[PDB]
């Protein structure tokens, strides 16, 4: 039912963080100024950082869902889940062990994000166009989304992250 937040968007996918917030990969989104979800610019604002694109609608587009916590990446070693969807409607929860930050070239830009190692169990990975799918993990009792899928390397993936932490500190 968290899978219902992951929806086809542009040439990739997107995720509903809340009823007002929709995040996706910048490199798969429709052109700047395109009417989406029956909403035109003015009904929503747009912010971005690297390949992370964030839509905020003044009116709720998804009433059925509560706000999920969005955080700028996560601790290294934490096993997250990339919620991958396909055109056929197939759902693939890929376990990814998040690691260090790195840079990569997607289109005409060099973008940054937190890398991750795809975990093979004992029983394929991502394709281009899985881009925009969310990286989620459970924080004790609470679900947290930490970023959107950017790309896979030539078992390493990388997710675009976003957000200014609530806590601020110090001036060395």
3-state secondary structure 114-131: EEEEECCCCCCCCCCCCC
d(CA 122, CA 135): 22
Dihedral pair phi/psi, residue 4, rounded to 5°: -70, -15
φ/ψ of 118, rounded to 5, equals: -65, 125
Coil, strand or helix at 12:
strand
Dihedral, 120, 121, 123, 126 alpha carbons, nearest 10: -30
Q: What is the DSSP letter of 41?
A: T
Burial 143-152 (b: 16+ CB within 10 A, else e): ebbbbbbbbb
Token digits for 136?
Answer: 């989620």
Residue 131 sits at φ, ψ, to 5 deg, of -55, 135
Contact 21/55 with Cβ under 8 angstroms? yes
Radius of gyration of the chain (CA): 16
Q: Are residues 113 and 102 in contact, defined by beta-carbon separation less than 8 angstroms?
A: yes
d(CA 86, CA 108): 26
> Mind listing the domains of the chain with CATH numbers?
1-67 (2.40.10.10), 68-172 (2.40.10.10)
């Amino acid at each position: 039912s968290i899978w219902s937040r992951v929806v086809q968007f542009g040439t990739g996918w997107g995720f509903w963080v809340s009823g007002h917030v929709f995040i996706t990969a910048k490199h798969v989104a429709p052109p700047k100024g395109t009417e989406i979800f029956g909403r035109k610019p003015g009904d929503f604002t747009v912010t971005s950082s690297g390949d992370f694109l964030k839509y905020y609608f003044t009116s709720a587009v998804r009433p059925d869902i509560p706000a999920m916590v969005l955080e700028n990446g996560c601790q290294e070693g934490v096993v997250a889940s990339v919620l991958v969807k396909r055109a056929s409607g197939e759902m693939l929860a890929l376990a990814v062990r998040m690691g260090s930050q790195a840079a990569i070239k997607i289109g005409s830009a060099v973008v940054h994000g937190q890398t991750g190692m795809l975990l093979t169990g004992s029983n394929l990975g991502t394709i281009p166009g899985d881009a925009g799918c969310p990286y989620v993990y459970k924080k004790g009792n609470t679900w947290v989304v930490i970023g959107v899928h950017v790309a896979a390397t030539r078992n390493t993936v990388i997710a675009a992250t976003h957000g200014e932490p609530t806590l601020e500190a110090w001036q060395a």
